[PDB]
Amino acid sequence: APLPEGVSAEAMSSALDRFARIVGADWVFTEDKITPYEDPYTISNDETEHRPYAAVAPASTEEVQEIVRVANEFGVPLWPVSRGKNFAYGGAAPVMSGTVVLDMNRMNRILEVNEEFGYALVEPGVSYFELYDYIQEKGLKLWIDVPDNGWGSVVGNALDHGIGYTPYGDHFAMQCGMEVVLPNGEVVRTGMGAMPGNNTWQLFKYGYGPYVDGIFSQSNFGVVTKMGIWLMPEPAGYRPYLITFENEDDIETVTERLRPLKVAGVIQNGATVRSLVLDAAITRTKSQYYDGDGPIPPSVAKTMMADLDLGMWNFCGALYGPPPVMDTLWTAIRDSFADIPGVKFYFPEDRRHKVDLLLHRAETMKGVPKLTEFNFLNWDGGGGHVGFSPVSPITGKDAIKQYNMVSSRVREYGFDYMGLLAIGWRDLHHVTVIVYDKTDPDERKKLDELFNILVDEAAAEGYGEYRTHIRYMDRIAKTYSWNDNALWKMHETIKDALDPNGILAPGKSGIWGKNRR
Amino acid sequence: APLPEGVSAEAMSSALDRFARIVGADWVFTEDKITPYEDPYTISNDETEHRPYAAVAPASTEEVQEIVRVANEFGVPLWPVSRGKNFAYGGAAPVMSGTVVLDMNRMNRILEVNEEFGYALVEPGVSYFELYDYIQEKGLKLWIDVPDNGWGSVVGNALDHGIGYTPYGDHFAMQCGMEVVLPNGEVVRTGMGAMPGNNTWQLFKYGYGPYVDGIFSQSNFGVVTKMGIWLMPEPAGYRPYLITFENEDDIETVTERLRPLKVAGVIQNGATVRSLVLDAAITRTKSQYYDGDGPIPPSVAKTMMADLDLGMWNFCGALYGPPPVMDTLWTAIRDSFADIPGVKFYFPEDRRHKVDLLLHRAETMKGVPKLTEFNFLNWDGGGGHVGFSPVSPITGKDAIKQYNMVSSRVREYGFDYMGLLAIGWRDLHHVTVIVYDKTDPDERKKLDELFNILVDEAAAEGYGEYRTHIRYMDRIAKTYSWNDNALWKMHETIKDALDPNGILAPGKSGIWGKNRR
Ligand SMILES: Cc1cc2nc3c(=O)[nH]c(=O)nc-3n(C[C@H](O)[C@H](O)[C@H](O)COP(=O)(O)OP(=O)(O)OC[C@H]3O[C@@H](n4cnc5c(N)ncnc54)[C@H](O)[C@@H]3O)c2cc1C
Ligand SMILES: Cc1cc2nc3c(=O)[nH]c(=O)nc-3n(C[C@H](O)[C@H](O)[C@H](O)COP(=O)(O)OP(=O)(O)OC[C@H]3O[C@@H](n4cnc5c(N)ncnc54)[C@H](O)[C@@H]3O)c2cc1C
Ligand SMILES: [Cl-]
Ligand SMILES: [Cl-]
Ligand SMILES: [Cl-]
Ligand SMILES: [Cl-]
Ligand SMILES: [Cl-]
Ligand SMILES: [Cl-]
């Protein structure tokens, strides 16, 4: 780990000393204890890149504030993580080496769960597992909404615009109220929490005046120390389904049919249409169907589909509510797809495998945290992953163009194509997942190169990334370049106003601050 | 109209001159032509307050930018309005006298309406009437969501956190993408619009990085020149209803029953439970039931209820979707209230009056713009109104405490109590509307005083205002005072960074800028 540029050993040493006084000497980590904070899915081949210098683990908001005041005095940068499980995005590691990680794992109090109003107020350390377990224990009739990684932070995930698979799938949309330590060490509360004596912090997003909560998501404009989130009341009924399509070209008409269903909200959760290999790899690995080094051939695809009762495309969704509602919505959904040759429709009871994609996703779509999804990392013997999830119109043409662009490249590079088409509400994402051997330098180099080209080519077709790995944060920022990067010039203006010393997470979302820019 | 403090006649004159060059001499207004921009509902008795000095009406974004550059050179403040129909909030008038109004009425292009994706991209001048009429003409299967004032701006209303009465009732929540002229004259686009070549500006809110759209709502951080908004697909069915309650104390149990219905979204639009007089005054005036100068007595309330088939509380709501869905949801809603003594349930066909509250609200709850609501201003012979709409928990106790606090004061002051309980999703608002004779100085003084006391007393019970009249913008801002006004210190930090010369709308949301603070 290099020192961060511009920062002396005397400075970094005096700071680490004062941090230790603030949080106690037990909660300042260095040297050997810093490896948990390295990116678990190494992309770079240069070991001077994305290296944390140290980590400090405060117990409270006020300790966070003192840390930040100290960081300001010594010019030492901080990289805040809630729990730091941002796997595929860098884990807990900074964009910039020398950055001291601010690990808020120990701030894990569930401050409130309110059944009657359907919310929680949580600290950054609270995991999905913990919140879920708290709810189950108290018997509250509330669902949470989990990403495929159950170990993540409710806070951290939402601040990064993460998603899940219930009607409450847009995590940051369900955010309501936050406490923030600003980069100068001042503490503020957004919304109704700015009003002393309110009982409305988790009931009404705006409060009064400029709506600023969003500026602390995908941002280095502050450290979030408390955050509210809305929780769905247990519904009166729940039916998960899987609809399979046999032909790779079906995704065009499938996307066309999904469009009105999503816009009108007939489909109540995110639509996910996953490619064969991405779904297969939940229950199977490559060597069980194909011994070659290259991607699987069509004949092997067909075998896999026949074994697993999957298609080339697999649409998982769920119905929620009283049976009459669920039946009516299902009529509309099923009728939208029934005339496509080869289509098949499944509820859980129709699956003949007891370990099965639908049975797994059934849990995720009712907000049960699991680690099952990490299975796809075993596809080629064990590896890391990176994901590329640009936004596009919900159009057949856009869906199949991205499929064609991505699969051809990915397969040319020797990887299997693992993709899905995700629809939030009016937004389509073609999500590429590439599993690679992160221990092999030749494979990292190929991945890095493939990734860049995918990004470049997608951007030119008008498809921009909304969430990315620490390594590509600058690159993605350059996508949004209208009027000579006018938006990022504004971000930098706010950055310098709130963080003149540039001590919060230099490089996050490609925002640097005047000192490093 | 006084000059704005700190600004010379030479400066104000050179600026008005350069504005005229930018937009043409026809589109700079002064003296007599400035009266349309006065508050129509005068509250102040001091005619030096909230007076606009001049108004300038650009044709384009780029003209806006040149105006702003000129404003910066001469230190002349601007007050931007989309259409300036903010009736009950000041209309088009500035907080601070001497402020030149930036009227964007002529920027009224509907840039796009997309049926397949359910959105519009509009300029600030577009009215609800215009957008509605455009849709009807083209035969697009889309609803809009209108406030009770149909003459408002789709943009302006949303930026002020305005509301309506369909499922798309939270206007700023449905906002997606905006173009903004910053206070330095630079132009930026938020979200996917920052990415050149996107077709996704109105499909995905976030883009990448800090989510900043909200900072330009209830704000003087920029001028919005284009804005996207999501539009609901025409639903498969629509049944509006009215549920009446006979007793003033029923609102307690009514609010308790509404809570789970709203949180779970069984009620698909905003719930509005309006008091007798507020609903009566849509079709009747006071002198038709009572000749006294004071508020109506109970005996007269009873007569009105029996004439109009209204209760002391009137819950308007609507069902949306296929009949099976609507029936199922109605079963849950009706069962939630059926056991309350005196309760009555109406669909349109059950109303015996052809001019009737439900028949009016039926239109509003399917997004048809109307001016009918302004009828309540005739309650006591013709007047203005002001509204007070603080947030509270959805609780019977909170509902009836606010009813008791407000009605007693309002009636003591000689006004009739006109109130409603509004529920967005998890948020209750007790909304006080007070109709007053705006031409009478004694009545203005009483109103102003009543308003202050209501605000003070509500704040102490933990109920804070989310939207207010230009006159009370500072006052409401002081509500949100946690940690020595930490939030507003942050607002002011951003204000000085984006607007160092303080030329955009000094005082909006009680944000002033370093020059005037
Ligand atoms: C197999 C697999 C499946 C995945 N599935 C999903 C999925 O379905 N949905 C999804 O959203 N993601 C998914 N991910 C990505 C990721 O693992 C999750 O999003 C995870 O929840 C994020 O980590 P975290 O919650 O611990 O957040 P953190 O790592 O704590 O935070 C993420 C980032 O947010 C910022 N941040 C966090 N806390 C603060 C704070 N208090 N103040 C300021 N900034 C802060 C920082 O930039 C930080 O680096 C997946 C990854 C893998 C490998
Ligand atoms: C009887 C009655 C009923 C009402 N019912 C409702 C209702 O149901 N729902 C509701 O929401 N309101 C309601 N109102 C309040 C108000 O009339 C409406 O909200 C109206 O739609 C707002 O005016 P406008 O749309 O022309 O916005 P504008 O007056 O153009 O804008 C409002 C404010 O937003 C800011 N602003 C506007 N445009 C920009 C921009 N481009 N850049 C920067 N800042 C900008 C300014 O501060 C401006 O003063 C009601 C009022 C009355 C008297
Ligand atoms: Cl969704
Ligand atoms: Cl084996
Ligand atoms: Cl079913
Ligand atoms: Cl709503
Ligand atoms: Cl008459
Ligand atoms: Cl019905």
Numbering used by the authors:
A (entry chain A), B (entry chain A): 3 to 519
Q: What does the report in the manuscript say about this coordinate set?
A:
Enzymes of the vanillyl alcohol oxidase/p-cresol methyl hydroxylase (VAO/PCMH) superfamily are found across all kingdoms where they perform a range of metabolic functions. These flavoproteins share a conserved FAD-binding domain and a more variable substrate-binding domain that enables interactions with a range of substrates. One of these, the 4-phenol oxidases/dehydrogenases, catalyzes the oxidation of para-substituted phenolic compounds. A fundamental distinction is that the oxidases efficiently react with oxygen producing hydrogen peroxide whereas the dehydrogenases hardly react with oxygen and typically employ other proteins, such as cytochrome c, as acceptors.
We further studied the P151G mutation to assess the effect of removing en bloc the side chain, and P151N and P151T to test the introduction of hydrogen-bonding groups. The P151G mutation was found to elicit the same oxidase-activating effect of P151L whereas P151T and P151N conserve the properties of a dehydrogenase. Spectrophotometric measurements confirmed that the vanillyl alcohol-reduced P151N and P151T proteins are hardly re-oxidized by molecular oxygen though they retain dehydrogenase activity while P151G can effectively turn over using oxygen as co-substrate and the product is formed. Conversely, in the dehydrogenase variants (P151N and P151T), like in the wild-type structure, the loop obstructs the access to the N5 atom. Conversely, no tunnels are present in the wild type and the dehydrogenase mutants where the flavin re face remains fully shielded by residue 151 and Trp153.
